Amino acid sequence: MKKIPLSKYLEEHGTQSALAAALGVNQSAISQMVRAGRSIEITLYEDGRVEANEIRPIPA
Template sequence: MNSIPLPDLVAQKGQAAVAEAFGVSPAAIHKAVRSGRKIVVTIHEDGTYTGEETRAFPCHDSPRSPQGPGQVKTPSPL
């Protein structure tokens, strides 16, 4: 097994090849790299790839929009 940061893998293999290996669009790979997400890809002996993201918990990166007047939060049915 070999581990490599996602941006390095994209530089080696190309965005389209990495996207195909993960079953996502090239745009999704581009966005993950561009936004600086900390993703490490493991290349397994059989040629399959798995990715793991390291992220702080709790993560408050994306600001939540405050409720405006007249807006009501509906509880999730789950």
């Protein structure tokens, strides 16, 4: 397993198009996360699965 911030993932690994498909999300949700500088972490499994999580501090 590898975990990787969103912008590094896109800048260095995969495309928005590909990530959107592997997460089963609307491509424009990815665009929105990039624009707003949301703290999104991408997880890459050896089985091929890809997951995404926003890390939100408490308090905000």
